[PDB]
């Protein structure tokens, strides 16, 4: 590990500087180094890890979608044959994206999840596992596609089961998990009715628990509730 000689605290500090500088690849490399120190991550550290890799993979996904659309146009009837280049470059971006996902999943399996006992850590990491298998599923076409989808589903479902037993319905981790699992159902599993049902039930159960919250907690929860409503509006 290129970060093996850097102090854990210095890696965390530099991840925060990289965030301020919008250097998300650096941020992710610093947080990977911090994870590889072997200690559990605090709440703030878990979110630094997720912010970093979400920005990296998000850029890769956006680029993959542009290239995939170009490739699809180049393959329809009447199109001029442009050679192997579009496929090759889409494949390059896809392989890099898969590499990022494999790296995140590797950190979760070695050994973040197995040491995560509190709901706020374990649900967060299982949500991340579902998310990164979902990103793999977005680009998957081979013999293992169904297994990739099922790996995402299984991780999301374990996270859901814990979240329902161990967190209030307004907990922002629980809400974001449900939001993302709902998108998994809609976009990956071809289950739009399950997606809509999950978003609606999550929103309504959160609404009913808002009365228990402080002003700051209310803001955190209602922000994600609005994303649930935004998706419901898109889908109905």
């Amino acid at each position: 590990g290129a970060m093996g000689s850097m102090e854990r605290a210095s890696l965390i500090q530099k991840a925060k500087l990289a965030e301020q500088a919008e250097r998300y690849e650096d941020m992710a490399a610093f947080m990977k180094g911090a994870v590889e120190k072997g200690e559990e991550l605090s709440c703030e550290e878990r979110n630094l890890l997720s912010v970093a890799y979400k920005n990296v993979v998000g850029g890769q996904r956006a680029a993959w979608r542009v290239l995939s659309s170009i490739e699809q146009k180049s393959n329809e009837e009447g199109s001029e044959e442009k050679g192997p280049e579009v496929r090759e470059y889409r494949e390059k971006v896809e392989t890099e994206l898969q590499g990022v996902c494999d790296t995140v999943l590797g950190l979760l399996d070695s050994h973040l999840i197995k040491e995560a006992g509190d709901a706020e850590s374990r649900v967060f990491y299982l949500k991340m596992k579902g998310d990164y298998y979902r990103y793999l599923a977005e680009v998957a076409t081979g013999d293992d596609k169904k297994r990739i989808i099922d790996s995402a589903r299984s991780a999301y479902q374990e996270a859901m089961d814990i979240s329902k037993k161990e967190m209030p319905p307004t907990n922002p981790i629980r809400l974001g998990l449900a939001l993302n699992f709902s998108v998994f159902h809609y976009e990956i599993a071809n289950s739009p009715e399950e997606a809509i049902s999950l978003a609606k039930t999550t929103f309504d159960e959160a609404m009913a628990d808002l009365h228990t919250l402080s002003e700051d907690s209310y803001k955190d929860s209602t922000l994600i509730m609005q994303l649930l409503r935004d998706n419901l509006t898109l889908w109905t």
Partner: peptide, 5 residues
């Protein structure tokens, strides 16, 4: 695309 966090 739909919203995720």
């Amino acid at each position: 695309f739909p919203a995720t966090v």
